[PDB]
Design a protein around this ligand. Structure first.
Ligand SMILES: [Mg+2]
Ligand SMILES: [Mg+2]
Lengths: 543, 543
């Protein structure tokens, strides 16, 4: 979109790292300013020190709220605290240790101030808790693929996955209460006191994760295939993980750069001209894509390593296409998974998944947008796979027990290699065969502004408020305001025919709504769905 | 001194974690009673690193309060120009300085848009301000010069524009340490936001008046007319914007070989000892520009504070002593407005080629101890036309015989090399060959080794008569000095001279070592004989 989309970042594009880090300490949120408040949701709290939305007082307040909340839930084991490669993860990490140790909380960290992927934290929690003693949980310090100036912090309970809204709303309220009270009632000691306390233990989390990969992906088959693999670590938290994977499993796996740089200067600019480490963006992935002819398969991950991008000589795979291929493969190549093991899908993901799951005779569980809906099912092994169209997924170990109950970018990348090794066809070739079999669907997302009134309207709709009988030439077969799979409110509307669908829901961050549309007939028909979706939305939300 | 990895490009493993280092500034403290963590505020101010508890918020708060007090006690009531270089720790130090000075009621002038400012641009701004004849300005320079990326520095320039002398620095050091010992009670401080809102901080462009003023010190017209192809390696330092503005304003064919600013300094080639040091006088650090030396008539580099200079021609990196001699020989023949009384300042460990040039010109040579502070008074009142140190630092007067910068100025020294080439048709290296023909071709070297502290102390307080040897390397000893001939200040060691050569010995400031500087006009073999006898004389006089 933007003029400089896909261009190499320039010096003028870059943050002053030390200045931003200083701002964490020297700038504060304005009392009574809602934009500076803690907003702690499914992906935790994100902001920037320079915008007064990610500073020492936020992290102090959040850390205190988490300490109290976990105690309230009888969690007495260690808290695994991992951080990504964003600048603001460094001071936030120190603040967390200061508050947790002050509250009597044992902490486990990566040794040598190293970095830890979100799924490595999830996996560490699960492995710890399998042993049946005091329960471990985790904090992940990352704003995912947000620009270099942003910081993030989120909480993972003992089930290893993202905290649900019952926990996050309590943490939010408590953190904001603490902020309004000028941090009195935040307990804190110095970093030196925290290190002397005996609460902080440094371990290597890399080695147990990497060695454990044989229990989830067929690494021997990958090795024996002798594929030429490439990875762009994109300066993220799993850079050391990829190196160790290549060594330990003897893979022909090349890191196309090994840079860690808190300005992320090696990046190509994203579609809106910002530096964004989005492994699913063709603009951001421009570096790896210029080299796609040099590998059988290549991949990238966002900085927290919970999302994935798959590259073949054909280009960057669309996330929906890869989800369908991964599901089709896994459920035919996992003999130990029980007959009851289901497929979790968000309702805005491609109906190609529906086609695949129905074909396998498997149970499809459609849920609202969000990975949180998969956590319980992955944890207890009733979901074999849960994915979202925004390129994040997870699946079970070979034996049908969880590996990571948060999204895991590394197992998704390695799965692509397993698929290619085992079947002799890369995931793109598999998708092409699926398209020949079921039709090649055309998928698009739209967005426009909406005032809070219309945004709230769309949020609480009834199914029969749609005065539409048809959609792009076809009779309407379903009108949904709740997800078929778990019956949870979708916070919007989905409309289906035999040949396509659209779903509409408000945005979390901006005053806007989004429309997802797909046609199994093609682009022209999809464009017709788009037009009618806009008309239906503007008519349903006109009052 | 020369490591396996000298001259190699820095690797990811060589780099600091900038945000972690910056956080340490705020979260780590100097330890009560540890001399290593104390303020050590001397000739080039106080330097250290946050990760070693020697450059942290308490140090800078203490030093800034001590500076505010000292300047007030001396009746300095105008603004304080506060400039910073591109090291990471310069950013939190800069904020601490603003917080304390604004709290103390000091008007601060800073570079707009959080820009960087060379040391000589601070000196120049002070001098230009004070010529207007109102309340006196002074300045603070936040830089540890060419020290590695993890280091921080801060120093004070009084209203004479130059480095503070021992009388000032001793009082600042003692007060800062008293403030630290008292837990920073009696440091006045306000928040960064309050400082900004107070009206005490004024952001201006210091670049333009410096750049425009250059025509009053160097013959920029002659340079433009010669149409030289010039190159610059800014080495990620504070003057990057200055070189760009100079090329634009004066219409020069001047190319920056890279414009990287990176607080890890990852673009650097490693120095002689395999560390990252931004030393414009090191062939190893300069490897990048040297590889390009055939592309330019002349090329320049500066250290990060831009008070030192490196001059490159197709023949390589010019020896700093050689260039001093050439600059002096040129200036005193090409500056008709300078009075007959105007003298030449030289540190007494600089080449005796300077003595011979100055003698030939019929000028007064003023030999001073190590330390540029010994030239400030003379440059300020115009009685010194030039002051130079063998460590690649010099300054000289404007055309009219008034001062430009009373600190060392790397920019004018680089531009002077272009003037010489443009005016005479011969580059500075070619001029040196003519000097060697008139005076002999000296061979100069520096030695180091360990000594006990008693020996190190004893070295400082020797007598001349105490060197019983009457001959140095074949020739009669003509002088034995314990004090500088030009100003009588103690050299803190010994210099022994003959008609054909000399040596000087002095304790290292930092290490448990002594240094010997040796030079012969009879050549390398003779110089090595001086070396041998110097080591023997030193050993003999030091029990
Ligand atoms: Mg992510
Ligand atoms: Mg310097």
């Amino acid at each position: 979109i933007h003029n400089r989309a896909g261009q190499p970042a320039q010096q003028s594009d870059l943050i002053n790292v030390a200045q931003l880090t200083a701002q964490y300490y020297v700038l504060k949120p304005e009392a009574g300013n809602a934009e500076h408040a803690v907003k702690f949701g499914t992906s935790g709290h994100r902001g920037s020190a320079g915008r007064h939305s990610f500073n020492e007082p936020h992290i102090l307040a959040i850390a205190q709220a988490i300490a109290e909340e976990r105690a309230k839930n009888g969690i007495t084991g260690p808290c695994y605290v991992g951080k990504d490669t964003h600048a603001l993860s460094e001071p936030a990490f120190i603040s967390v240790l200061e508050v947790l140790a002050a509250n009597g909380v044992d902490v486990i960290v990566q040794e040598n101030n190293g970095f830890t992927p979100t799924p490595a934290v999830s996996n560490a929690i699960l492995v710890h808790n399998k042993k049946g003693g005091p329960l471990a949980d985790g904090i992940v310090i990352t704003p995912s693929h947000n620009p270099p100036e942003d910081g993030g912090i989120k909480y993972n309970p003992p089930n290893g996955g993202p905290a649900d809204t019952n926990v996050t709303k309590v943490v939010e309220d408590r953190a904001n209460a603490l902020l309004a009270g000028g941090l009195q009632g935040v307990k804190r000691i110095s970093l030196d006191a925290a290190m002397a306390s005996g609460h902080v233990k440094a371990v290597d989390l890399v080695q147990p994760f990497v060695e454990g990969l044989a229990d989830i992906v067929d690494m021997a088959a990958i090795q024996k295939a002798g594929l030429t693999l490439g990875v762009d670590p994109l300066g993220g938290s799993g850079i050391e993980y990829w190196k160790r994977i290549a060594e330990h499993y003897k893979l022909n796996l090349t890191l196309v750069n090994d840079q860690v740089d808190q300005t992320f200067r090696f990046m190509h600019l994203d579609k809106d001209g910002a530096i964004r480490m989005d492994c699913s963006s063709e603009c951001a992935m421009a570096g790896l894509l210029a080299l796609r002819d040099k590998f059988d398969l290549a991949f990238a991950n966002d900085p927290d390593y919970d999302r994935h991008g798959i590259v073949t000589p054909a280009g960057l795979m669309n996330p929906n296409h890869y989800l369908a291929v991964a599901i089709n493969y896994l459920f035919q190549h996992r003999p130990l998974w029980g007959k009851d093991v289901a497929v979790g899908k968000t309702l805005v993901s491609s109906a190609m998944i529906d086609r695949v799951v129905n074909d396998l005779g498997r149970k499809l569980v459609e849920v609202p947008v969000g990975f949180k809906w998969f956590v319980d099912g992955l944890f207890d092994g009733s979901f074999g796979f849960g994915g979202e169209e925004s390129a994040g997924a997870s699946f079970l170990r070979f034996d049908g027990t969880p590996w990571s109950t948060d999204k895991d970018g590394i197992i998704m990348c390695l799965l692509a290699a397993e698929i290619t090794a085992v079947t002799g066809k890369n995931p793109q070739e598999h998708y092409n065969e699926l398209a020949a079999r079921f039709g090649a669907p055309s998928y698009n997302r739209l967005q426009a502004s909406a005032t809070s009134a219309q945004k709230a309207a769309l949020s609480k709709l009834s199914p029969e408020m749609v005065s539409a009988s048809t959609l792009a030439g076809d009779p309407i077969t379903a009108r949904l305001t709740a997800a078929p799979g778990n019956g949870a409110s979708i916070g919007g509307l989905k409309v289906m025919t035999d040949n396509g669908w659209f779903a509409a829901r408000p945005s979390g961050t901006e005053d806007a709504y989004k429309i997802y549309c797909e046609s199994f007939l093609g682009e022209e028909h999809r464009k017709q769905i788009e037009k009618e979706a806009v008309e239906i939305v503007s008519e349903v939300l006109k009052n």
